[PDB]
Design an enzyme around this catalytic site. Sequence first.
Site, PDB file in Angstrom:
ATOM      1  N   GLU A  91       0.831  -1.195   0.000  1.00 30.52           N
ATOM      2  CA  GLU A  91       0.000   0.000   0.000  1.00 30.52           C
ATOM      3  C   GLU A  91       0.871   1.252   0.000  1.00 30.52           C
ATOM      4  OE1 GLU A  91      -2.112  -1.536   3.409  1.00 30.52           O
ATOM      5  OE2 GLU A  91      -4.023  -1.236   2.405  1.00 30.52           O
ATOM      6  N   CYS A 104       3.838   8.456   1.067  1.00 28.46           N
ATOM      7  CA  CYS A 104       4.380   7.495   2.012  1.00 28.46           C
ATOM      8  C   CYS A 104       4.532   6.166   1.277  1.00 28.46           C
ATOM      9  CB  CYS A 104       3.424   7.384   3.187  1.00 28.46           C
ATOM     10  SG  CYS A 104       3.947   6.172   4.390  1.00 28.46           S
ATOM     11  N   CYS A 111       7.052  -6.839   7.096  1.00 23.81           N
ATOM     12  CA  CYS A 111       8.188  -6.387   7.888  1.00 23.81           C
ATOM     13  C   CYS A 111       8.555  -7.485   8.864  1.00 23.81           C
ATOM     14  CB  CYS A 111       7.884  -5.116   8.694  1.00 23.81           C
ATOM     15  SG  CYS A 111       9.378  -4.432   9.469  1.00 23.81           S
ATOM     16  N   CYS A 115       7.600  -4.890  15.793  1.00 27.92           N
ATOM     17  CA  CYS A 115       7.217  -3.953  16.845  1.00 27.92           C
ATOM     18  C   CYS A 115       5.806  -4.268  17.327  1.00 27.92           C
ATOM     19  CB  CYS A 115       7.290  -2.512  16.333  1.00 27.92           C
ATOM     20  SG  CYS A 115       8.935  -2.073  15.645  1.00 27.92           S
ATOM     21  N   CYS A 118       2.589  -2.479  15.836  1.00 28.92           N
ATOM     22  CA  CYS A 118       2.508  -2.228  14.401  1.00 28.92           C
ATOM     23  C   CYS A 118       1.788  -3.367  13.686  1.00 28.92           C
ATOM     24  CB  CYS A 118       3.915  -2.064  13.818  1.00 28.92           C
ATOM     25  SG  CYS A 118       3.922  -1.760  12.032  1.00 28.92           S
ATOM     26  N   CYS A 335       0.002   5.585  10.133  1.00 30.62           N
ATOM     27  CA  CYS A 335       1.193   4.899  10.579  1.00 30.62           C
ATOM     28  C   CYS A 335       0.785   3.694  11.413  1.00 30.62           C
ATOM     29  CB  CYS A 335       2.131   5.718  11.477  1.00 30.62           C
ATOM     30  SG  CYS A 335       2.670   7.167  10.608  1.00 30.62           S
TER      31      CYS A 335
HETATM   32  N1  LIG Z   1      -0.020   1.635  15.683  1.00 34.65           N
HETATM   33  C1  LIG Z   1       0.823   2.629  15.421  1.00 34.65           C
HETATM   34  N2  LIG Z   1       0.470   3.908  15.735  1.00 34.65           N
HETATM   35  C2  LIG Z   1       1.264   5.000  15.480  1.00 34.65           C
HETATM   36  N3  LIG Z   1       2.472   4.849  14.879  1.00 34.65           N
HETATM   37  C3  LIG Z   1       2.838   3.593  14.539  1.00 34.65           C
HETATM   38  C4  LIG Z   1       2.047   2.464  14.799  1.00 34.65           C
HETATM   39  N4  LIG Z   1       2.719   1.384  14.314  1.00 34.65           N
HETATM   40  C5  LIG Z   1       3.889   1.785  13.809  1.00 34.65           C
HETATM   41  N5  LIG Z   1       3.968   3.150  13.920  1.00 34.65           N
HETATM   42  C6  LIG Z   1       5.079   3.993  13.489  1.00 34.65           C
HETATM   43  O1  LIG Z   1       5.058   4.215  12.086  1.00 34.65           O
HETATM   44  C7  LIG Z   1       6.345   4.719  11.702  1.00 34.65           C
HETATM   45  C8  LIG Z   1       6.781   4.233  10.314  1.00 34.65           C
HETATM   46  S1  LIG Z   1       6.938   2.424  10.252  1.00 34.65           S
HETATM   47  C9  LIG Z   1       7.910   2.342   8.714  1.00 34.65           C
HETATM   48  C10 LIG Z   1       9.376   2.808   8.830  1.00 34.65           C
HETATM   49  C11 LIG Z   1      10.287   2.091   9.808  1.00 34.65           C
HETATM   50  N6  LIG Z   1      10.090   0.657   9.711  1.00 34.65           N
HETATM   51  C12 LIG Z   1      10.168   2.561  11.255  1.00 34.65           C
HETATM   52  O2  LIG Z   1       9.725   1.802  12.125  1.00 34.65           O
HETATM   53  O3  LIG Z   1      10.524   3.701  11.555  1.00 34.65           O
HETATM   54  C13 LIG Z   1       7.308   4.306  12.809  1.00 34.65           C
HETATM   55  O4  LIG Z   1       7.751   5.464  13.523  1.00 34.65           O
HETATM   56  C14 LIG Z   1       6.450   3.350  13.618  1.00 34.65           C
HETATM   57  O5  LIG Z   1       6.866   3.122  14.953  1.00 34.65           O
HETATM   58  S1  SF4 Z   2       7.113  -0.033  13.096  1.00 32.92           S
HETATM   59 FE1  SF4 Z   2       6.250  -1.649  11.769  1.00 32.92          FE
HETATM   60  S2  SF4 Z   2       7.278  -1.281   9.776  1.00 32.92           S
HETATM   61 FE2  SF4 Z   2       8.619  -0.031  11.348  1.00 32.92          FE
HETATM   62  S3  SF4 Z   2      10.112  -1.691  11.958  1.00 32.92           S
HETATM   63 FE3  SF4 Z   2       8.363  -1.870  13.391  1.00 32.92          FE
HETATM   64  S4  SF4 Z   2       7.149  -3.604  12.542  1.00 32.92           S
HETATM   65 FE4  SF4 Z   2       8.496  -2.838  10.841  1.00 32.92          FE
END
Ligand SMILES: Nc1ncnc2c1ncn2[C@@H]1O[C@H](CSCC[C@H](N)C(=O)O)[C@@H](O)[C@H]1O
Ligand code: SF4
Length: 341
Positions: A91, A104, A111, A115, A118, A335
């Site tokens: 996406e 974006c 991934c 995290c 996420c 995000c």
């Molecule tokens: N449920 C959520 N709510 C708000 N931000 C989130 C989220 N899940 C992930 N993110 C944030 O989305 C951003 C981009 S994620 C993609 C880039 C990279 N993998 C990274 O982690 O930075 C990151 O700062 C991540 O922590």
């Molecule tokens: S926030 Fe989501 S996309 Fe960024 S490293 Fe963590 S699992 Fe991967």
Amino acid sequence: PMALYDLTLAELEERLAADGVPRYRARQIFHWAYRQLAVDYDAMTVLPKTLRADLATRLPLTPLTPVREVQTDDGETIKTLFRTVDGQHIETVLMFYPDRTTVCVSCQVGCAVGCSFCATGMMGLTRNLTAGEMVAQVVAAARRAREAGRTLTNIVMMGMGEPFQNYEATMRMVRILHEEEGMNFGARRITVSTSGLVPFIDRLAREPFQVKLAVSLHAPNDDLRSSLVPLNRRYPIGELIAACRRYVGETGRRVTFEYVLIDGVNDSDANAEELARLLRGLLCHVNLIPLNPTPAAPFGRPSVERINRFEQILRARGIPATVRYSRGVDISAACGQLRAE
Ligand SMILES: Nc1ncnc2c1ncn2[C@@H]1O[C@H](CSCC[C@H](N)C(=O)O)[C@@H](O)[C@H]1O
Ligand code: SF4
Ligand SMILES: [Br-]
């Protein structure tokens, strides 16, 4: 298997020459692909028909097929689902702001970092995207922006995936987009975000392209950070901050830190004070992102009062900080919400 969007201008010149095609055709193809945003080779009327057919057969223009588009009620956030040649999905999100237009971009199918908050991490890693699959998202977004009276001005590598686990392809995308005869996209207009792979921060500091660096932090100590970001077990917070200090020392450029605020996890006054101590003296800016909802969601978003207090503490200690409520929550385009259906 290459698409046009995988190649630099010089590489395209050499590919054409190997087939007996004049090298000057490469600049014409770049003009039509990137300045005219051609949808297919038959739109490139300056080229002989036989050459358009050779390109379509041997060097497909784009590696992505758009499947579905949805937008917010106000029309300012647009999410597109694309299918890859191997039947997977990613996406993109296009955002209209008062003074800029930002795409974006995803860098992986899924991934691997995992995290805990996420939704992309919940799908696991299928594969890295090629540079051409990243360029393809940018071209499609630039074309969609033009329909709205806009030129695409900025790129953020904040879609699905960890860019520093796909570093070479990400930097190849930067180089291809920078081509003056193509998108002529300045590197300062691109932000690369990482969950914190230390050695690639050091590599980025030495690249000739002045991209903006964002680092996803989410916690000010190792015990807390490892509970949220599994990569912290391998590249701990002290090493991560030291790498950011070296990056600023080498480049003179600011590091942006992302910090997702989660109710009862990382949002206390003491957490904010510890974060300010961790970041002391560093040329940086903290974006505080109130947690966005995901299907799993064991965690919640803090109150507005808690969010504002956290921001107030950081600013009072001399750390620039802004709360950024994500756009696209109503269409699952914010995000952390990208699951590719
Ligand atoms: N449920 C959520 N709510 C708000 N931000 C989130 C989220 N899940 C992930 N993110 C944030 O989305 C951003 C981009 S994620 C993609 C880039 C990279 N993998 C990274 O982690 O930075 C990151 O700062 C991540 O922590
Ligand atoms: S926030 Fe989501 S996309 Fe960024 S490293 Fe963590 S699992 Fe991967
Ligand atoms: Br020719």
